[PDB]
Design a protein around this ligand. Structure first.
Ligand SMILES: [Cl-]
Ligand SMILES: [Cl-]
Ligand SMILES: [Cl-]
Ligand SMILES: [Cl-]
Ligand SMILES: [Cl-]
Ligand SMILES: [Cl-]
Ligand SMILES: [Cl-]
Ligand SMILES: [Cl-]
Ligand SMILES: [Cl-]
Ligand SMILES: [Cl-]
Ligand SMILES: [Cl-]
Ligand SMILES: [Cl-]
Ligand SMILES: [Cl-]
Ligand SMILES: [Cl-]
Ligand SMILES: [Cl-]
Ligand SMILES: [Cl-]
Ligand SMILES: [Cl-]
Ligand SMILES: [Cl-]
Ligand SMILES: [Cl-]
Ligand SMILES: [Cl-]
Ligand SMILES: [K+]
Ligand SMILES: [K+]
Ligand SMILES: [K+]
Ligand SMILES: [Mg+2]
Ligand SMILES: [Mg+2]
Ligand SMILES: [Mg+2]
Ligand SMILES: [Mg+2]
Ligand SMILES: [Mg+2]
Ligand SMILES: [Mg+2]
Ligand SMILES: [Mg+2]
Lengths: 196, 203, 213, 123, 220, 199, 204, 216, 202, 196
């Protein structure tokens, strides 16, 4: 059980993900990264079945980078989200479906920040905030309660923390640390891990 | 198994093959499937050997006691009713297809079928067991109202011989019994005594 | 394997007014793709003040109504008064629960007068969960009937509309309309609509023809 | 099983078997209870002395639970039955109510046990 | 569904009800179940509605190519073979149960065609969830060599039996009458069922519905 | 369903939605999910409606017999234990009950979670039902023992509300009760659509 | 049920020289709402729209693949598609997947691009078409929708009356379905304009 | 019964002016095998009441045994009360429901016909305790093949004479013989009127096979 | 279904009942189960109607073409071999029990069985279908080497009548065909023309 | 999943248990106590199926207390363990089996400290140390590595801590606090919870 979260402010998208790789009753890695850089202003966050998750995300990543090399400019976040969706949907009924749940976060020069949610069935929804994993059941209502559309990034990192503190308090799984990144006009920034 | 009984004026004829199988192993090739229930009342047994032996033994007990109490020979219809009551009541726990046939002074020669499930019906003649399927046509074409004892024995032996040829679960010898006011006459047809009908080999 | 249940169709409806209750049902009894009979009402008179509607498995509807009938007489003998609409409802909840592990496959709606003479409707699930309602549809076409009642009786989703008391005349027109609508779309609802109106004067009966296909 | 009606009424409204049970109590060793301000004391006539007795084994004052005890007079073998019934009941109470018994609760239990043995066949 | 057909003295009468259901709910009250194959051949359909539609459309189209090539009116046997060979190849997975009738150079012909690809050539046939009701009418009343009006009466009676006794059937009776000299596609033939009146009126005036947002986009 | 309860300085807040479903069909929006067991004890309905109502009605009967026999009101501990013991015998038979037993006795405000799986636990706060995960998020971020009475009402109300927003199986009206030392009171009943306009 | 995994409801309704199409706004996964602005109705022409209920992924795929085919059609033919022709195009697309279907049951509403005659239809998931002269419904509350439409619809409604009727039919139907709602969008299609409204609606 | 063994097919009934007529073929089938070709599936219960049964014949014989003994018991009292058709139908409904509720049904579908106090009675009871009354009834395949014909005639003319009802029943038996693969062309008709219960048989329908030459 | 064929000196007799059932509904009470494959070669069909119609159509095509190429009448044995090849090859996807019978100038009247599974054997007479079980005894007792055409037609009609009485899946009319160097003679026995054997009443 | 641990020194038995009551993806209580006082010198620690655990442990507790009232002295730890085993074993093939896993810890005047392990099948083993729950898979080897029979109580608490720290590091479930008690000649003593 893996957790992803995104929160879109006016000019930025904040994303976080747990850093655990688990197997059976053990955590096998405590500094795992569930984020994939697609381009200077796009992150794909990918969870789900082992093998499928990295294979799918890295395929998308290489194709996004290829588009940049072929054309001299990048796909927009929206175009990248639709490209991702097309591939997942096209594989749904094939001999090689990918059992993956995703967020795509991006910043476009002209359209601003965008956050997209996709499930393994390949339904795509744009959202102001979203979360995947069992931890979403405990945190989405906190986001519904405290969010606003104009939420500043200092305040957004607090809101994120409340979600993460709620997992420490109430969720049955041990998820002690989280990767945190923010995207804006100036590209992808690493923030400090949030750790307990 | 193939079992059969047939009414005539003054009595009945009963017959059976003699094959008991477990799967397709013949565990008894000379089985006696005609079981006496009283002096002039027999049953022909098909289905589970354990079940039909257990039920026949119980009915023999019930009917014997009844007959001592009444100080009279039992009615064939009473024997059949006792089988029916047991076969119906325990229909979920028995695999038993029975023919009850005999003579009594009140109704003469009588044949009753108590098939699986425990219904009871009087018939002019009855057939049962796995091999009966193959002789419905033959018995339907061959039966005649008013057959003598010696004709009924021939009819039974012929029908059973036909069934035995075709049914893997039937075979061996033919056991026959004739029951009348005079008593019970038992015989066995074996080997060359069993009616023979050629295989239709090619011209 | 034997199944002890079959679905026999039937739609029921009850409405509480200020001084009346309506209990209505269609009269088709079905099984599989067949009609057993076109004249099988699903409403039963319990007392002068109380009627029950019962749909679902007809074997259970018949047994349950006979049990209720016996229990009302037992009550009257032991307590020297007829059971109230409310007491019938509370008792029925316990009868249904007695079969919690082999349920009566019956949807029940009681309509009658309460002890102040006001309309009362009680609705039940098959194991006896119940509550008082203003109006309620049950059975085969219930999903078809209920939203229109929500709208027209409850005034839901309507702006700038006065919330007047429900007249008998308007309640009757609504009842006939929702059943005619249901008969168009639910294969099980048809033949005729039987309506019982409970007031202080007694129980009266109307019947309206529905499509027979 | 033995179903004779043992305790029955007699003509003046008497229950003679209960009255005889009371006579058994009257021949028992004297027992006294006094309720103090913040203490409660039970004292009993020993029954005997008998120097060769192991004193421990014949006490007529018995703990029912940590907060309740009793003394009795009358048939000692009967008292042992009543005591052990009450001890079982004290543990049921703790089990189902998660409080110790009141003195009144267990007294009431003992009293209704005794009343039942005046109205039940065979006893 | 109730569909049926008979051979009468001079041709074929086909019949059908007009209900389509999804589960135990009526989706269409006026479904057309008598499908064009060629000007002289029609086919009633029961079973899976997309399969009956697409199967009849395909065969009709292939038959048109056939008749364009031959310059001749198509034969009922030809439609029968094309349908059954396709249905057989799909092993019953194409859920088309058909009553095929027409009139060709060899006269009137009527076939029942089943999803697995069996066909029966017969003087009367029925299919669908109402088929036993309709067949009862035929067994009781069919005579060979009926006149046109008697045959139309018989088929509508058979369809009506399905309509009233099968929960899967309803609404109208359609007929198609095919002879050497004429084709009468009678949709509806009879309307034995009708919605009851509305006794109340629920005509909601402007502003009854509260609105959150509105955008008007003018068009040319 | 979403139900919640919590102990605090001024008693126990108890709140619920009012929706019942049969599959995806909304069968009612006026269910009373706070069960008035008696004047000093409340229970809550989640899981199976009949199962909660029937067994809590039996609890009410037994608590009253207790009061008559013993001349004092049963404790919250003892009442919750009676309920647990009643349902334990039926484990594996498909009862579905998840309830909070809420009162105020000699040990002060009392709150126990009891269910058909056999659980019986005392605690500061609980939420039960299909929407419980959503209520927990909001309740947990706002809860304190030292909440003022009106702040506790607002929290309870908002936690149920937010559950109704995310959980398809929760909705209708938010019903709120407050167990005080001299008995419970009904605080409010607010339609979710009217709460939407407010929040 | 696959068809209820995301929930949702669509309906279309015919008026005098106008049509209406409406949909709920919820995107959810079983009990969990994920967004409340999910698009289920898509323009296929200036006066021709398709509404899709069912599995959200297939709602999106069918809309996109249909648009692909329609754009090519219009480029090749040099005209706007007729409503009946769009229906046929959609039927063909769905039936291609007869043995592994898309889990969507579309409704179409529009006006003929040359005559402006009203058209409505629906299709099942394998492409069986049904045209009506009144209304069509598709979704997890079809029964609730049938009940409202049967009781409220009348022939030859003007655009204002059509708007109120379709709106009341949707709002009251979805309010009896756990997995449909979170808002309602309505398009009224007339010869000279499209009017798009979102309704004040329950959000539970 | 969990698993029916020897079984009977349809039973028909129709009300007429002054009585009721019921019909049933004389076959006990054993799966597809037409095994027992001369069995009665109709019982005279008492002077006012008769019963016909589809389904497991052993279970029907049991009901006949029980019911027959119940009427004997009542007749011994000689007290002026007799079970009405309606009372018998009630009893049967309870008996079937009770056996259903023990998960051990009597595997039968029954038609009860009667005439008492100037009223024709016709009632249905199945193995689950589903029971009702109607002007005509048909169990088994009769529900699909005979009931539509019965109801069509009754709509045109709700009140039939005895002879009209009898001719209608014969038409239905013919249809059943053509189209039910478990039927047999040897049947009984039983009638109840003011005069009592009369069972007629064995009867046969005339059949027509002209369609055999109409393939082309 | 019950099917049968029987050899005589100079030809064959074929027969069938006419009942087609779906479950216990009779969907066709006048089925023609005797299908011509060539001028003097027929097959009797039992099992799945779709399967047997499809296979018979395909063999008719194959045998027709063969016969035109050879410019000779086809052998009965060739027809049977063609059925066998298809029935054996596709035994896991067919439910087909076939009797092939006919006349040719080389071997005269011949009867072949191709039962389920696709073996092939020549027989003096053959029976098949669900109803054949009930007539094994009867045919075994009644068959006589050297029967005439008029005797073989009687034997077939009798056997089929007996099967039809007892088998719920068989019934209707009896269709008969006799094939010889002179041609094919078809007839139907219906109603009172069907041989009658009393029910054993009393 | 619930965790129990016991460590027996010369003259004492140290026990601990997690304080979590979980249901589905949530902790519903974080101060839960899995220990039941049977007598002045016996603790029973019980985990397993809901309902069964408390019903079984409290039945045993009442009966141990009853023995004391009837007889004027307490059951020994060994006698109490065997009584417990008899009941669990007697129920195993009944209509009312109890799905519970147990430790019993005690001190006897004459025999010293004892620790008993029992599984739901009612196999009873005396052990110098033992643990139940998925957490035992991660902690038993630590006990095997560091334990000795003469281990002092101040060292035993450190050893206990290392086991609990291992659960925080490596176990996938969130078990942040533990009840800790020690039994010796002077009865049962509560120690500070060990918390993270
Ligand atoms: Cl042998
Ligand atoms: Cl048998
Ligand atoms: Cl037998
Ligand atoms: Cl046998
Ligand atoms: Cl205690
Ligand atoms: Cl053909
Ligand atoms: Cl159909
Ligand atoms: Cl409410
Ligand atoms: Cl009490
Ligand atoms: Cl607790
Ligand atoms: Cl819930
Ligand atoms: Cl708040
Ligand atoms: Cl495409
Ligand atoms: Cl017979
Ligand atoms: Cl009789
Ligand atoms: Cl065929
Ligand atoms: Cl074969
Ligand atoms: Cl064969
Ligand atoms: Cl066959
Ligand atoms: Cl036939
Ligand atoms: K043999
Ligand atoms: K209807
Ligand atoms: K037959
Ligand atoms: Mg894979
Ligand atoms: Mg046995
Ligand atoms: Mg109909
Ligand atoms: Mg096949
Ligand atoms: Mg909704
Ligand atoms: Mg909600
Ligand atoms: Mg258990």
């Amino acid at each position: 059980m893996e957790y992803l979260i995104g929160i879109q402010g006016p000019d930025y998208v904040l994303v976080a993900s747990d850093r655990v790789a688990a197997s059976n009753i053990v955590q096998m890695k405590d500094d795992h990264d569930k984020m994939f850089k697609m381009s200077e202003k796009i992150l794909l966050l990918c969870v789900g079945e082992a093998g499928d998750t990295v294979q799918f995300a890295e395929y998308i990543q290489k194709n996004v980078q290829l588009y940049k090399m072929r054309n001299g400019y990048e796909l927009s976040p929206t175009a990248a989200a639709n490209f991702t969706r097309r591939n997942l949907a096209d594989c749904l009924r094939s001999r090689t479906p990918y059992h993956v749940n995703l967020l795509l976060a991006g910043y476009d020069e002209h359209e601003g920040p965008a956050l997209y949610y996709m499930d393994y069935l390949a339904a795509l929804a744009k959202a102001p905030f979203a979360a995947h994993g069992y931890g979403a059941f405990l945190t989405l209502s906190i986001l519904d309660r405290y969010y606003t559309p104009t939420i500043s990034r200092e305040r957004a990192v607090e809101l994120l923390r409340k979600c993460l503190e709620e997992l420490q308090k109430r969720f049955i799984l041990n998820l002690p640390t989280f990767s945190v990144r923010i995207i804006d006009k100036n590209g992808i920034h690493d923030l400090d891990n949030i750790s307990f | 198994t193939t079992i059969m009984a047939v009414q005539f004026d003054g009595g009945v004829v009963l017959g059976a093959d003699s094959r008991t199988t477990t799967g397709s192993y013949i565990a008894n090739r000379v089985t006696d499937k005609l079981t006496p229930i009283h002096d002039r009342i027999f049953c022909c047994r098909s289905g589970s050997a354990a079940d039909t032996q257990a039920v026949a033994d119980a009915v023999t007990y019930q009917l014997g006691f009844h007959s001592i109490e009444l100080n009279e020979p039992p009615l064939v219809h009473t024997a059949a009713s006792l089988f029916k009551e047991m076969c119906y009541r325990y229909r979920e726990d028995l695999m038993a297809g029975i023919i009850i046939a005999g003579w009594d002074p009140q109704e003469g020669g009588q044949v009753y079928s108590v098939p699986m499930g425990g219904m009871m019906v009087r018939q002019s003649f009855a057939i049962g067991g796995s091999g009966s399927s193959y002789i419905y046509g033959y018995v339907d074409a061959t039966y005649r109202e008013g057959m003598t004892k010696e004709e009924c024995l021939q009819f039974t032996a012929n029908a059973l011989a036909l069934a035995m040829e075709r049914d893997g679960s039937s075979g061996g010898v033919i056991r026959l019994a004739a029951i009348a006011e005079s008593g019970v006459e038992r015989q066995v047809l074996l080997g060359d005594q069993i009616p023979k009908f050629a295989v239709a080999t090619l011209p | 394997r034997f199944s002890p249940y079959v679905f026999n169709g039937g739609t029921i409806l009850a409405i509480a007014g200020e001084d009346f209750a309506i209990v209505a049902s269609d009269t088709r009894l079905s099984e599989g793709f067949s009609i057993h009979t076109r004249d099988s009402p699903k409403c039963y008179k319990l007392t002068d003040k109380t009627v029950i509607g019962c749909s679902g498995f007809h074997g259970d509807c018949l047994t349950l109504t006979k049990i209720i009938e016996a229990r009302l007489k037992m009550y009257k003998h032991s307590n020297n008064k007829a059971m109230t609409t409310g007491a019938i409802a509370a008792m029925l909840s316990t009868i249904l629960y007695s079969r919690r592990f082999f349920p009566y496959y019956v949807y029940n709606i009681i309509g009658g007068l309460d002890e102040e003479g006001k309309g009362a409707v009680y609705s039940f699930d098959p194991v006896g969960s119940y509550q008082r309602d203003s109006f309620k549809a049950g059975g085969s076409a219930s999903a078809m009937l209920q939203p229109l009642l929500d709208n027209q009786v409850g005034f839901k989703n309507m702006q700038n509309v006065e919330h007047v008391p429900l007249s008998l005349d308007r309640a009757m027109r609504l009842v006939k309309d929702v059943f005619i609508s249901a008969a168009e779309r639910d294969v099980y609802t048809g033949d005729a609509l039987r309506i019982c109106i409970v007031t202080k004067e007694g129980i009266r009966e109307e019947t309206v023809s529905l499509r027979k296909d | 099983s033995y179903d004779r009606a043992i305790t029955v009424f007699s003509p003046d409204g008497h229950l003679f078997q209960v009255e005889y049970a009371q006579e058994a109590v009257k021949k028992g060793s004297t027992a006294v209870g006094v309720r103090g301000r913040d203490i409660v004391v039970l004292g009993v006539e020993k029954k005997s002395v008998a120097k060769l007795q192991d004193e421990r084994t014949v006490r007529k004052i018995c703990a029912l639970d940590d907060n309740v005890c009793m003394a009795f007079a009358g048939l000692t073998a009967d008292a042992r039955i009543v005591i052990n019934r009450a001890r079982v009941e004290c543990q049921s109470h703790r089990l189902t109510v998660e409080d110790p018994v009141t003195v009144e609760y267990i007294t009431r239990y003992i009293a209704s046990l005794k009343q039942r043995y005046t109205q039940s066949n065979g006893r | 569904t109730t569909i049926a057909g008979v051979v009468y003295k001079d041709g074929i009468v086909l019949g059908a009800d007009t209900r389509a259901t999804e589960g135990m709910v009526v989706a269409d009250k006026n479904c057309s179940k008598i499908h064009f194959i060629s000007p002289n051949i029609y086919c009633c359909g029961a079973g899976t509605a997309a399969d009956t539609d697409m199967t009849t459309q395909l065969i009709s189209s292939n038959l048109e190519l056939h008749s364009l090539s031959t310059g001749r009116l198509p034969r009922v046997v030809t439609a029968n073979r094309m349908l059954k060979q396709m249905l057989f190849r799909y092993q019953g997975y194409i859920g088309a149960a058909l009553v095929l009738g027409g009139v060709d150079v060899t006269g009137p012909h009527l076939y029942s065609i089943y999803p697995h690809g069996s066909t029966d050539k017969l003087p009367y046939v029925t299919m669908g969830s109402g088929s036993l009701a309709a067949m009862a009418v035929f067994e009781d009343k069919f005579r060979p060599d009926m006149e046109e009006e008697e045959a139309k009466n018989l088929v509508s009676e058979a369809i009506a039996a399905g309509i009233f006794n099968d929960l899967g059937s309803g609404s109208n009776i359609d007929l198609c009458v095919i002879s050497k000299n004429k084709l009468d596609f009678l949709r509806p033939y009879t309307v034995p069922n009708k919605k009851g009146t509305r006794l109340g009126r629920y005509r909601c005036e402007k502003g009854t519905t509260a609105v959150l947002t509105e955008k008007i986009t003018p068009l040319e | 369903t979403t139900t919640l309860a919590f102990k605090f300085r001024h008693g126990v807040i108890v709140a619920a939605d009012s929706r019942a479903t049969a599959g995806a069909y909304i069968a009612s929006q006026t269910v009373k999910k706070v069960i008035e067991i008696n004047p000093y004890l409340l229970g809550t309905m989640a899981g199976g409606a009949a199962d909660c109502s029937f067994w809590e009605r039996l609890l009410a009967r037994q608590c009253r017999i207790y009061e008559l026999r013993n001349k004092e009101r049963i404790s919250v501990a003892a009442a919750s234990k009676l309920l647990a013991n009643m349902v334990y015998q039926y484990k594996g038979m498909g009862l579905s009950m998840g309830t909070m037993i809420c009162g105020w006795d000699k040990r002060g405000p009392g709150l126990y979670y009891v269910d058909s799986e056999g659980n019986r636990i005392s605690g500061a706060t609980f939420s039960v039902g299909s929407g419980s995960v959503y209520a927990y998020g909001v309740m947990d971020r706002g809860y304190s023992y030292d909440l003022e009475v009106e702040q506790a009402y607002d929290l309870a109300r908002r936690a149920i509300y937010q559950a109704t927003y995310r959980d398809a199986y929760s909705g209708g009206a938010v019903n709120l009760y407050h167990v005080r030392e001299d008995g419970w009171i009904r605080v409010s009943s607010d339609n979710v659509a009217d709460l939407h306009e407010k929040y | 049920s696959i068809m209820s995994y995301n929930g949702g409801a669509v309906m279309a309704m015919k008026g005098k020289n106008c049509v209406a199409i409406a949909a709920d706004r919820r995107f959810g996964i079983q009990a969990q709402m994920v967004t409340t602005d999910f698009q289920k109705i898509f323009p296929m022409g200036d006066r021709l729209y398709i509404g899709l209920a069912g599995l959200a992924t297939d709602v999106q795929t069918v809309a996109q693949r249909l648009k692909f085919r329609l754009n090519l059609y219009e480029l090749k033919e040099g005209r706007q598609i007729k409503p009946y022709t769009l229906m046929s195009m959609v039927a063909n697309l769905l039936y291609e997947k007869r043995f592994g279907p898309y889990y969507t049951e579309p409704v179409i509403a529009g006006l003929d691009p040359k005559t402006f005659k009203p058209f409505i239809c629906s299709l099942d998931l394998i492409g069986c078409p049904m045209v009506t002269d009144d209304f069509v419904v598709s979704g997890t509350c079809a029964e609730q929708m049938y009940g409202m439409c049967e009781s409220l619809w009348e022939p030859n409604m003007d655009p204002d009356h059509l708007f109120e009727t379709i709106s009341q039919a949707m709002l009251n139907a979805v309010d009896r379905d756990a997995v449909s709602g979170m808002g309602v969008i309505v398009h009224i299609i007339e010869k000279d304009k499209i009017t798009t409204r979102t309704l004040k609606a329950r959000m539970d | 019964t969990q698993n029916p063994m020897v079984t009977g097919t349809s039973v028909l009934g129709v009300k007429f002016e002054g009585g009721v007529v019921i019909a049933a073929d004389m076959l006990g089938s054993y799966g597809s095998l037409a095994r027992f070709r001369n069995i009665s599936r109709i019982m005279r219960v008492n002077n006012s009441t008769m019963l016909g049964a589809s389904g497991d014949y052993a279970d029907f014989q049991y009901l006949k045994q029980v019911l027959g003994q119940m009427v004997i018991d009542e007749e011994l009292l000689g007290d002026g009360h007799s079970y009405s058709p309606r009372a018998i139908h009630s009893w049967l409904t309870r008996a079937m429901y009770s056996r259903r509720s023990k998960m051990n049904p009597l595997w039968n579908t029954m038609v009860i016909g009667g005439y008492a106090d100037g009223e024709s009675f016709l009632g249905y009871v199945d193995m689950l305790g589903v029971a009702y009354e109607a002007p005509s009834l048909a169990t088994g395949y009769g529900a699909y093949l005979a009931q539509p014909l019965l109801r069509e005639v009754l709509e045109k003319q709700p009140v039939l004479s005895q002879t009209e009802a009898r001719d209608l029943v014969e038409r239905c038996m013919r249809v059943l013989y053509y189209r039910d693969a478990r039927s047999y062309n040897r049947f009984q008709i039983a009638t109840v009127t003011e005069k009592g219960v009369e069972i007629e048989g064995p009867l046969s329908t005339e059949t027509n096979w002209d369609i055999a030459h109409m393939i082309s």
